[PDB]
Design an enzyme around this catalytic site. Sequence first.
Site, PDB file in Angstrom:
ATOM      1  N   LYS B 188      28.002  78.260  57.846  1.00 21.45           N
ATOM      2  CA  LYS B 188      26.583  77.959  57.962  1.00 21.45           C
ATOM      3  C   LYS B 188      26.339  77.077  59.179  1.00 21.45           C
ATOM      4  O   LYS B 188      27.174  76.244  59.538  1.00 21.45           O
ATOM      5  CB  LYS B 188      26.053  77.258  56.712  1.00 21.45           C
ATOM      6  CG  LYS B 188      26.013  78.134  55.483  1.00 21.45           C
ATOM      7  CD  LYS B 188      25.035  77.591  54.463  1.00 21.45           C
ATOM      8  CE  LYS B 188      25.062  78.404  53.183  1.00 21.45           C
ATOM      9  NZ  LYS B 188      26.414  78.953  52.900  1.00 21.45           N
ATOM     10  N   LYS B 282      29.193  84.360  40.697  1.00 19.46           N
ATOM     11  CA  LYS B 282      27.740  84.439  40.654  1.00 19.46           C
ATOM     12  C   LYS B 282      27.327  85.558  39.712  1.00 19.46           C
ATOM     13  O   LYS B 282      27.930  86.633  39.714  1.00 19.46           O
ATOM     14  CB  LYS B 282      27.167  84.679  42.057  1.00 19.46           C
ATOM     15  CG  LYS B 282      25.730  85.154  42.084  1.00 19.46           C
ATOM     16  CD  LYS B 282      25.119  84.978  43.464  1.00 19.46           C
ATOM     17  CE  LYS B 282      23.604  85.057  43.410  1.00 19.46           C
ATOM     18  NZ  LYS B 282      23.137  86.396  42.962  1.00 19.46           N
ATOM     19  N   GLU B 414      23.703  82.026  58.764  1.00 20.77           N
ATOM     20  CA  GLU B 414      24.797  82.277  57.836  1.00 20.77           C
ATOM     21  C   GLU B 414      25.622  83.437  58.368  1.00 20.77           C
ATOM     22  O   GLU B 414      25.094  84.537  58.556  1.00 20.77           O
ATOM     23  CB  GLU B 414      24.264  82.596  56.441  1.00 20.77           C
ATOM     24  CG  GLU B 414      25.208  82.273  55.311  1.00 20.77           C
ATOM     25  CD  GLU B 414      24.483  82.118  53.990  1.00 20.77           C
ATOM     26  OE1 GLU B 414      23.476  81.382  53.947  1.00 20.77           O
ATOM     27  OE2 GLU B 414      24.918  82.734  52.995  1.00 20.77           O
ATOM     28  N   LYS B 446      20.627  74.158  50.101  1.00 18.77           N
ATOM     29  CA  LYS B 446      19.189  73.913  50.077  1.00 18.77           C
ATOM     30  C   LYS B 446      18.766  73.133  48.837  1.00 18.77           C
ATOM     31  O   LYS B 446      17.868  72.290  48.912  1.00 18.77           O
ATOM     32  CB  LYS B 446      18.430  75.238  50.157  1.00 18.77           C
ATOM     33  CG  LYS B 446      18.635  75.993  51.458  1.00 18.77           C
ATOM     34  CD  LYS B 446      18.185  77.437  51.337  1.00 18.77           C
ATOM     35  CE  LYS B 446      18.153  78.125  52.691  1.00 18.77           C
ATOM     36  NZ  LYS B 446      19.355  78.964  52.922  1.00 18.77           N
TER      37      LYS B 446
HETATM   38 MN   LIG Z   1      23.034  81.673  51.514  1.00 16.47          MN
END
Ligand SMILES: [Mn+2]
Lengths: 678, 611, 102, 102, 101
Positions: B188, B282, B414, B446
């Site tokens: 990132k 995830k 990203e 974030k």
């Molecule tokens: Mn992301």
Amino acid sequence: MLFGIKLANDVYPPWKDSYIDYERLKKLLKESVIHDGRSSVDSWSERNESDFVEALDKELEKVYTFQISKYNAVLRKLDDLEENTKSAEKIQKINSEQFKNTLEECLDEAQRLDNFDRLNFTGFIKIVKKHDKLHPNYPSVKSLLQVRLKELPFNNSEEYSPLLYRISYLYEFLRSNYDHPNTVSKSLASTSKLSHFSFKSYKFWVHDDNIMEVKARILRHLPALVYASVPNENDDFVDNLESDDPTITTLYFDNDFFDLYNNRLLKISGAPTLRLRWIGKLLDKPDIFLEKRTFTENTETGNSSFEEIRLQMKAKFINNFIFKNDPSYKNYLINQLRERGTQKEELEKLSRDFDNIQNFIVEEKLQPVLRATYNRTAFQIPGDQSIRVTIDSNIMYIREDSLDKNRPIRNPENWHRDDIDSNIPNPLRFLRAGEYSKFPYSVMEIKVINQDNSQMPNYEWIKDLTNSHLVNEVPKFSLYLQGVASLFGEDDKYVNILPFWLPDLETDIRKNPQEAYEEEKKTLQKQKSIHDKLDNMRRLSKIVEAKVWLANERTFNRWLSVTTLLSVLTFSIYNSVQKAEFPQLADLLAYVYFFLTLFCGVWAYRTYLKRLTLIKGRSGKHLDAPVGPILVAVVLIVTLVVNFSVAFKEAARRERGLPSLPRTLKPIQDFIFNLVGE
Amino acid sequence: MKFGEHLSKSLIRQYSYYYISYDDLKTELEDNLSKNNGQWTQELETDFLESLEIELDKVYTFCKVKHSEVFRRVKEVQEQVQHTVRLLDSNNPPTQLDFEILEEELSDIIADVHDLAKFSRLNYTGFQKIIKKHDKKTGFILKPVFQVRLDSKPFFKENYDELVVKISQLYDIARTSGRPNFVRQTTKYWVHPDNITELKLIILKHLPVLVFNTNKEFEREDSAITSIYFDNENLDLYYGRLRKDEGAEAHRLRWYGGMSTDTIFVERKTHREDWTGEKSVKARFALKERHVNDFLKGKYTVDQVFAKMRKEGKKPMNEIENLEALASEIQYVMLKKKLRPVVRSFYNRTAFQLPGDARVRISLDTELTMVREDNFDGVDRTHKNWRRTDIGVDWPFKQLDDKDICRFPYAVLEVKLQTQLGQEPPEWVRELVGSHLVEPVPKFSKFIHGVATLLNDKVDSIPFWLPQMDVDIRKPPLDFDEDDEDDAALVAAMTIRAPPGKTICVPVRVEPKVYFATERTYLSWLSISILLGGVSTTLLTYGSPTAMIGSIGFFITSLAVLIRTVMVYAKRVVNIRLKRAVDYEDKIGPGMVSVFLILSILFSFFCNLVA
Amino acid sequence: RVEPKVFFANERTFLSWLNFTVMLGGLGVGLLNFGDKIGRVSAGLFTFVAMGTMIYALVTYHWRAAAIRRRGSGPYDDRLGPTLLCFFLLVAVIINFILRLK
Amino acid sequence: VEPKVFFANERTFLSWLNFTVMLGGLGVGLLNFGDKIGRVSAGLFTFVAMGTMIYALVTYHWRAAAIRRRGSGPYDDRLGPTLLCFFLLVAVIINFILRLKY
Amino acid sequence: EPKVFFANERTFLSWLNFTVMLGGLGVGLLNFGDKIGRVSAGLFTFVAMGTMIYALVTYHWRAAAIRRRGSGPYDDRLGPTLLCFFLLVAVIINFILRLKY
Ligand SMILES: [Mn+2]
Ligand SMILES: CCCCCCCC/C=C\CCCCCCCC(=O)O[C@@H](COC(=O)CCCCCCCCCCCCCCC)COP(=O)([O-])OCC[N+](C)(C)C
């Protein structure tokens, strides 16, 4: 109305004879014998073909000679007004009134000539297509029409006639510097949009053999857009590691008189089009969008503006929405969006759009007519609305109307055709001849935006690609107009006007590089001359991770070394018990140290094997075994403390009732002997 | 800046040495023009055409060879896949290895096809550029003549899209029938708004753009993404994600587009760690908007969630059961921990990737904004809803007071790489990541940034990047032996602050080859104690009564050293186990051993040489 | 293209193995010089173990040196030796303890 | 922040401490048990052991400046080990000569 | 390179460890042994001292031949073999002399 009635009612009374003889040609074609069937005995002979070719030849000769004569007459009058212009001297001798009247007469003549050309071209194309449909054995007669069209002084296209540009800039100079007042005329102001001083679109046809080259030329400058579907309810996963072209269909709307097609073909400002759009198959429940698109021109610059109203539809609510004028869908959607959490302004805009489109449909009596399917490819830089390129391929038109009141192609109470959208794997086999059409080329559109008054875009690679052997420019081409012309263009009942690009479809549109270069040179020379003349008269006359393996091996080696040292100490203590001052004590230390060396060896081997298992493959939270290192140390502490305590407990009993100790060290023992307890 | 310079790093080295010699031809043209001082000669044009013809022939032959190879590989793999499918119903069809190698071969073929297409396009562009330059500089005309020669050898008219479609179809078939190497990298970066256009132009030269529209048009609301993050009053999940605990979970509700969307995705991110490193997972499942609130209170049962999927039967039943279990876990956690919406993140996303190719993927997020949605202050912002409806997808959100909105001043880049073992990532990616356009910020998030910035009067730990938010980031253009490795490190080594009330929290990771280090050190101590202990015993049972006080001294020294080593080992193990930061320099050991040994030796000498 | 850092590692491994065998041989010689016939037998067994370890160490060192001489990269794996030494030492210790116990 | 430097420092310190531990054990054994020869040689060996211990501590605390005062190049300390490499030989020769007398 | 110098230092430390252990054992047996034990301990301590001198010479040569970057005695094939021979001979003589009388 019928084409014959429109032809009869639009004849200029001074020009009765110059028009086409449509009825005579139709009768000479013996279309009645084709129409009626019973007496089909009298077939087509060579004398009949010779007579028909003869009549067509003289009809074309008369019409086009009259057109050329009129065109030659008008341009020359306008050349005169041009003399009283060049000279920065004959300028002061000019008069406003006679020039204004001459310009008005020229404009009227140009408009009349345009109407005459449109009517005659429509009639000739209809006659040629009617003849070609019947009698397939004999050769086609389109060559005569092509030869006659090629002889015209100008180019047959939907662009504005050159006379319009000439009159426009003549009027611009007349109004600019000579006399600002005493103009009065307002009809001549409508041509002011053509005066040279934004959003410009160019349309081209591309052959299948040239698509890859033009794609490479475009990709040199612009990226490619790849369609990605938004995630839906079928894309839910359980446990993954981190970082683990559709066919477009548009159905168009029009009424029985084809008012929208007529107004679009006539370049009437504000002419809208209405369509339904989706992708894929209709049995997958895709998103359906109802669009109304309008082009309007309100400026003296001539730049147009485009407006679109878009609504999202549900497959169940379309029938009531477009046929029964049911307002149920509007209220249902407004309530649903209000519940979802949409603001007030968006709801107001949505209500206004619903009202506008529903009122349009009700007032104009629009209904589905045809369906077009194609594939789209786009090129544009994200976040940059300066330029866009799009290409449509595999275009196919299908009739989807209900004009026949006895055998409708689509049911009058259904918004779409039923047979096409069935579950059969190949429904298009059901289609009969004459109910569908295939466009042979690919359609490329280039949209260039120059917001500032920069005097047209005039950008480099666009003009390089335009003047090349790869593309064929067709100004003001439209897929809807081409579809209407292809499907319904042979019927006099429906279509009474046809676009000027129809003859170019039959010819081979491929070009050699040499001819393309010559045409580019001619076009550049003409543009340069026009620009130089404009500048001259404008202002000059102006007023495998082995490391872990090695570490495991070294740890095992260290464990082995500790075991060796412990065993050495154990046996050294054990094999000398007879000489110990307390032999009853040396027999326990050896036992405990033998136990310790056995435990150290066993633990070393077991930990080595377990860690080798963990290293092979990839598993295990941590590589450690703290039990052995703690137990060994604890047992050593216990053994040492016990040995010390027993030794100094028995060192007092032996000196009681039995010299050896120094005097200075006498008190010290009395401390330990007190700590032990004697 | 040179065209040949960009040609060199466009692809891998195996495709080089076959490109058009644009630089050589340009230099030859300029040199000949300078030597003859204009006045082009027919023989010079003849040599120019001969060089152009030999270059064209080389490029055409290479393209033909590559096309034949690609087509042969596709045919062989298609036949192999068909045979494997025919053998699927037979006895013992392998699924863990043959399918994987088939997929790897398919991916390699896709990469080769894409590289060949790019090679052809670049060579055509170079040919056109050099022909145009020769036509412009020299009075002679060559474009119409050389167009015929180019058309006679059409190395640029081949359509590779149909091959891509066929290989993707085979990949889909293998994936469908395969349900009973390579390395990831993910980084990132922060990008200044002044450098966004240049970065986008650089990226666009290698990857196309993804458009989420049926007309392939760029609309305003087609790229918006909105997420609502869930947390409790104590901010347990915030701390669990900051200190990267095992099993730390983040729960969010996500949707794409404007406020008309009726599909909300419930997503859970779970953090897991091994001695290999960073095995995170995830999960997500879809839901309807009108049932979201009920699902947050348990009224909407899991049975009603998957009724449609069960009825249609398109999905296998085991996957439906797994999704049901995931939904049940999420609902149970939500009810038990008393989670509520705490923060919202909004941004516009642009994605760059090639169809069917996963070697490089780029994402750019702009207009990043954090909005407060909690009731901890004392003001109800959502009014019993799962999101506040007074704002939606309209940037900037000007109807929000400054205390409830944070506007990130940079864009977030990203980069995701999937590199095959034995080869380096593409040169353009490496030149991009190291440059003056991006600033690397590893492990940026974030959710953590939003919580730290908005609820800054309720958190004790903050990330490392937060104090450095005022730093200007613009930059001007620019096997081995373990003991040997430790020796090299020793040779190499030998030759700002958080606001008061807050501490910069950073998790500490140790190399696996530290687990074997401490124990070795421990062992290297234990043996020493034994030696000293040995002295004790040989002075406890074999000596004269006048020499046992030295035995006491050695006993004390051995006990002290051994218990110290046990304490140090236990401390190190327990601290490394629970991810704390430790001191690896022991400053007390050598001194303590020195003083105790000196004291014991001198005392024994004195006591055995007294009186 | 050979560097001293690999010969140094080989020498360090060799001296580690000689450290093992020197400890074992010291125990054996100490038991041989003193003690009774039982001590003599234990000493003989221990010195046999030490001699075997020493010969194994020298053979492995020579093989490693030869492998380094013929370029390549070999001196990283050795698994039989540690297991053999562990088994031999456990057997030796248990046999000596049992024999002395009688 | 690199553990391996500190680990190597400790390894060197403990490798040096092995010598002192062994020599001190030998000295204590010789002084506590044995005739006048052992008591004479015990101090001679303990002096060398103390020297090695002090040298090891000084060298270790000298290398503990990896965090600050950087700039010290290669420690080519060829005078420390070698000067102490002769004291043990002197002690061995002295013991050989003096023991042979009686 | 300083790294190679420190590797040479580590090798010298290993050699010193081995020699110190051997010489300590030899002296310990010498000071508590009889005529046979005295001869055997003298032999073991002589072997240890010879190996220690050889290691010192090799360390001195290597620590100075690297600055010249010349040949260097990096490869050795006589030290270990001679040490093995001396240890084997000493053990054999000790055993035969202890069991002879
Ligand atoms: Mn992301
Ligand atoms: C290849 C390698 C070759 C090595 C060669 C050198 C070998 C050095 C050898 C011996 C060392 C010196 C020992 C002298 C002991 C005298 C006191 C005593 O109690 O003796 C008694 C027994 O003694 C034993 O049986 C004790 C066994 C000692 C084991 C080794 C301990 C040394 C260090 C190990 C620690 C690990 C090492 C870590 C570093 C330190 C005397 O008993 P006795 O019966 O009266 O005597 C016989 C008399 N008679 C025959 C007339 C009947």
